[PDB]
Structures are given as C-alpha cells and as structure tokens.
Amino acid sequence: EIPGFYNRFKTQAEKSTNTGLKGRLAMPIRANWGDVGKVVTIKNDLRQLKNLFGDDMNYSAFKLGKLALLGNVKELLLYRLVDGNQKKGTLTLKDTTENSAKDVIKLETKYPTARNFNVTIKSNLVDSDKKDFIFFENTKQLFSSSIKGTIDEIVLEINSNLDNEYVIATKVADSDTILANVVNQALEGGNDGCTSITNESYLKALEEFERYSFDSFVLDGVADEALQETTKAWVAKNKELGKDILLFLGGKTEDNIKQINDKSKSFNDENIVNVGSSAYYENIKYTPSEVAVYIAALSVSKGITGSICNAKTIFEEVEPRLSQSEVKECLKSGTLVLDFDDGDVIIVDDVNTFKKYVDDKNEAMGYISNIMFINTINKDTSLKRKEFVGKIFNDATGQTTVICALKKYFEELMSQGIISEFNVDIDTELQATAKADEFYWKWDAVKVDVMKKIYGTGYL
Amino acid sequence: KRKEFVGKIFNDATGQTTVICALKKYFEELMSQGIISEFNVDIDTELQATAKADEFYWKWDAVKVDVMKKIYGTGYL
C-alpha cells in the first residue's frame, strides 16, 4: 500500500463469547415453511429456527427443533421433507387503466408452504398514482409499502425490503398502468408439507444427509418401524464407510414397556438408542421419539467430559412411570427411559440398546458416553488421515512422527483428565505382516469413569 | 551421464571404476535425500563378459521409499 498509518479496528467479538454449547445433530423434518431439498445448518438461537422454518407447533420441524435447541446443540442441521406435489403459494395482480386488464405482477411465497399469507393493495391517500402494498398472514400484517403506478419500481421495492421476505414479486408484463386493488388476498396454489409423506421421502433425506458429518441422528421423532430398520442399515453402512454416526430412536406411544424392551432387544448395535418414556414440557405430551430428539441433543451437547445418567431434563412430567423393578428390566433390555427421581424429570442412565450383550463389546460400550468417546477418537484419527496418508515415507522417521502426533493427541486428552491411563505404540505384530505402503499401530486407554452408584454406611 | 562418459574414457578397469563411482555417488545423493531405502550398483559381469570391447554393461538394484496410502488402527479401552 501507500505509506501511512492505516488503522483497521476489529472489536467484533472482543468478549461477547461463551462456551456453553457443543455438538451437531441431524434432523429430517416436516415443515409448513422454509427451504426444501437442502440440508441447512441452524445456530442454537431459536429465532433462527422460527425465521427459517416458521413457528407452527403442529409440525415436526418447529417442535423438534425447539427440543433440540433446548438440548443445547451448537449447530442444528435440518432438512425439510416433502412430497413431490408440495408447492409454493401464489397470487397475481392486474392493471386497471385498460378495459382489457392484463396481469402485470405475480406474488409467490419465498418458501414452499400452504399458509394463508395475504396481501392488500389500496389507493394511496397522499399521492394519486401510488398504491399502498400491505402484506399479512391471516390478517396479521407483515409489511406495508407505497410505490407509484409503474410496475418495475413496484416489483423492485416489493423485492427490496427484507420485511417482505415472506414473498417474492415478479413482473408479468412491462406496464406503466395503475394496479388493481386487492384486500387480504391469500397467495393460493401452495401445498403444505405434511401431504403424503412416506418412507421414500425419509430415504431421500438420509441420502442427502450422507454428505455431512454428525454427532447423532434421531429420525424426525417418528417411530415407524420400516424407517427404523432402514436407518439402522444406513448407519451401519456409514460406520463401515468411516462415518461414525450415532442413532437415537423412540418407540411408539402404544407400545407397552414389554414391547419397548423387545424392540430394545431387537436393536443391539451400539449406535442404536431406544427411548421408551413419554414426557410433557409445556403441558404438551411428547412421544418417545419426540423426546428421543431431546435426549440425543443433550447427549451431543454433553460431548466428552460428561454423561446423561442423571442429567436434569426440561420436562415437567414423564410417563409411563417405573418402579425399580421396571427400571432394571428396561436397563437390562438396553432401553433408555426417563425418571422422576425428584420433583423434576431426570434421565435414569447412560444405557443404549446394545447393553443386552456384555463381554466382547464391553459393558462400557453399553453406555452412550463411551460410544461418543470412541466415535470422537475415530473421527480425530480419520482427520489425521489427510495429514499423514500419502505425505510421509513409511520409514522409521515417518512412523515416529505419526506415533509422536498420536501421543501428543492422547496426552492432550490426558491433560483434560478424560483418560486415566494410556499407551500408544506401533503394532509390530501386524507391522511385520504389513505391506510396504501401509502402517499398523495399536493403543490402549482407560476412560475416566463417573459415579452412577454410591453407597454410604453410618456409625453413631 | 552419457555425454560425460561415452566416447571420453577408455573402457579399461579405470574407466569402468570411474563410471561406477560416479553412479554410486549419484545413488548415494539419492540415499541422502531418503528417496531410496536400499540400493547397490555394480558392473553387469554376465553381460560384460559378452560385451564387445567398445561397450559397457552395468546393473543396479534399488528400493524406493514408500508412502502411506492405507493406515489401520485398533483400539483398547
């Protein structure tokens, strides 16, 4: 640059930061409003969810999004599910100067929907040629504007202000004629999003979700069986492909605790978590899958350095309600069920559906926190792939560098206290059999536990 | 190296030794860079016996240093 003393001030996030959030979650959702056919990330502010997908609790989108956000996920990734017939609302405007009136402007909702987004056009009381363009939803006004009677400036203004973000205006003809007055005319022709949604839509959503990486998946708070087996196979495929995705599920409200335990027996992969209990938060019930959304969100928000075996929930009630016998039955079945151990609703344990089996996949694998730990180690290691694969020569120096980097990572874990003991070394047994263009290595560790049970004995 | 050695040294033991020494120096330079893990370069006495007096035969083995394409890890907890 030219000589001088040029300041460039950077007080954007000086101390406006907090560290109370973590994790990311996947969400196929049915929605009346918002983008369609894309996987969109949502920051934890619910205002973003409300803006980008509406505020209708009749739909899985807003309700499950609110539950996930209250789960304190750092970034919530959504995908709007639709049938192919799903459509945008639309309205058309016409001129009045000519006896044979001609359509000159068309209004269409910015996102596909079927809501009653309405529009009003009336004569401007100040200027003769101006028309006052006002927009509503069921007469609840969104935005008002006034432009002279030329179509180009009218559509440009209507598309300019983001107060009119609900609707897009397009020019039908290049007229300079006075528009026709409308009063609360709905943008018709749209279709909602709950229309004929089937397993194929969920399959397409999952195929879209293959692109990204996630900490957990919950399947739209829907307990349809065939979707559950499909997602089970999909997660198994993703695991075999090096994508370590965890899955939470919730049974149907009609299922008895015996049926829920049978389903939790049917699932035995460690990445499957079955939720049995229903709950109420704002005096409104939530099916086991709807609360499975929340428990998955809370789990991913916990991340490492935590668990869920007694994490307090937002729910004001829980049902069905279990004695210690029923709780033990559910845990032995691998079911996760909420509890009312105190005046609040409390998560009973960290169990997953796998826990029915014991020894080879160890008992700690029956707990979700260990699976999150293993998936995190696999993810960081598969991040190291690109640092080390195809970039170092397999000699003693390259092996030493790889081992030193992994040792530094595990020592960082040790510094956090997550691991009580570890060692990582070359797998000389397999390294002897290794081909010259490959490397084998081994590591042992001991994750630091957490009190689930405590016992006290008193003397007087 | 052809232009350095062809038509400029007499095919005697001295010339063969000089050629072999130069090639050895080159391969040792490669070794110093670590590109080669092992090598040897020597006169091709099998073909040198059949070689005409105005020509030279030589042999060399080497082992290029590989790179990780595949890596596998196994975990214990």
DSSP letters for A321-361: ---HHHHHHHHHTT-B-EE-SSSS-EE---B-GGGGS-SSS
Of B34, B67, B75, the CB nearest to A437: B67
Q: Exposed/middle/buried for A253, CB within 10 Å: 0-12, 13-18, 19+?
A: middle
Q: Which residues pair with A447 in a beta bridge?
A: A419
Q: Which residues pair with A336 in a beta bridge?
A: A275
| Tokens (6 digits) for A270 | 């460690």
Identify whether the C-beta of residue A238 lies closer than 8 Å to the C-beta of residue A26.
Answer: no
B32 and chain A in contact, CB less than 8 A: no
Give A-chain residues touching B72 at CB under 8 angstroms: 430, 438-441
Experimental method: cryo-EM
Residue type at A98?
E
Locate all alpha helices (DSSP H) within A161-252, ordered by sequence: 199-209, 225-240
Chain B: nearest CA to A56, how far in angstroms? 46
A391 and chain B in contact, CB less than 8 A: yes
Omega prior to A3 cis, within 30 of 0:
no
Please report the resolution in angstroms. 4.1
| Nearest partner of A277 among A220, A332, A326, A214, judged by Cα | A326
| Tokens (6 digits) for A331 | 């845990």
Q: Reduced to 3 states, what is the DSSP secondary structure of residue A308?
A: coil
Interface of A with B in 419-458 (CB under 8 A): 427, 430, 435-447
Give A-chain residues touching B75 at CB under 8 angstroms: 374, 377, 443, 445
Give A-chain residues touching B34 at CB under 8 angstroms: 393, 395, 397
> In 10 A of CB A11, how many CB atoms?
7
> In 10 A of CB A418, how many CB atoms?
17
Non-local CB neighbours of A419 within 8 Å, separated by 6+ positions: A410, A413, A445, A446, A447, A448
Relative to beta strand A278-280, strand A317-319 is antiparallel
Identify whether the C-beta of residue B39 lies closer than 8 Å to the C-beta of residue B63.
Answer: yes
Residues comprising chain B, all counted: 77
A396 and chain B in contact, CB less than 8 A: no
Q: Exposed/middle/buried for A54, CB within 10 Å: 0-12, 13-18, 19+?
A: buried
B33 and chain A in contact, CB less than 8 A: no
Chain A: nearest CA to B68, how far in angstroms? 5
Q: Residue B20 to residues B2, B45, B63: CA-CA distances in angstroms?
A: 13, 13, 19
Residues comprising chain A, all counted: 460
| Tokens (6 digits) for A351 | 């169990």
Q: Reduced to 3 states, what is the DSSP secondary structure of residue A375?
A: helix
Burial A263-275 (b: 16+ CB within 10 A, else e): bbbbbeebbbbbb
Chain A: nearest CA to B70, how far in angstroms? 5
Strand arrangement of the beta sheet that strand B70-76 belongs to: A419-426, A438-447, B70-76
B37 and chain A in contact, CB less than 8 A: yes
